Design a protein around this ligand. Structure first.
Ligand SMILES: Cc1cc(F)cc(C)c1Oc1ccc(C(C)(C)O)cc1-c1cn(C)c(=O)c2cc(-c3cnc(C4CCCC4)[nH]3)oc12
Length: 109
């Protein structure tokens, strides 16, 4: 249930992604009412965002680092599922994904 890693995810991975210029549409859940997307919550069975991941790291939700990494990935794949390729939100998620994977490669064991 590695804690060096969970701590790394919070202070380094999440911190870096959260500062990114493209982070803002992923810092909270997709408000399907505001954005007028009635199908979103039927299509996306496991919504995810960095708001929720942050809360989970700050409140001892995660069993281990892999469970948290799945959530980061779910956020990205949720975005690629729902939206057409080429859409701006997809380019944004793609940039965030490069960076996420970079930072994951320097993870302590
Ligand atoms: C990044 C971006 C740029 C824009 F010019 C317009 C939007 C809506 C936009 O996305 C969002 C803006 C605000 C919010 C808030 C903060 C209110 O929850 C969310 C999004 C947004 C985030 N994520 C992860 C998404 O997957 C989608 C998807 C959409 C979206 C809204 N309308 C669409 C489609 C369906 C109608 C034709 C375009 N997709 O908006 C978001």
């Amino acid at each position: 249930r590695q804690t060096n890693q969970l701590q790394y995810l919070l202070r380094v991975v999440l911190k870096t992604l959260w500062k990114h210029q493209f982070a803002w549409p992923f810092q909270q859940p997709v408000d399907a009412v505001k954005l007028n997307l009635p199908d979103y919550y039927k299509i996306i069975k496991t919504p995810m965002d960095m708001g929720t991941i942050k809360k989970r790291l700050e409140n001892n939700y995660y069993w281990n680092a892999q469970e948290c990494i799945q959530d980061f990935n779910t956020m990205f794949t949720n975005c690629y599922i729902y939206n057409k390729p080429g859409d701006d939100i997809v380019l944004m998620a793609e940039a965030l994904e490069k960076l996420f994977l970079q930072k994951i490669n320097e993870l302590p064991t």
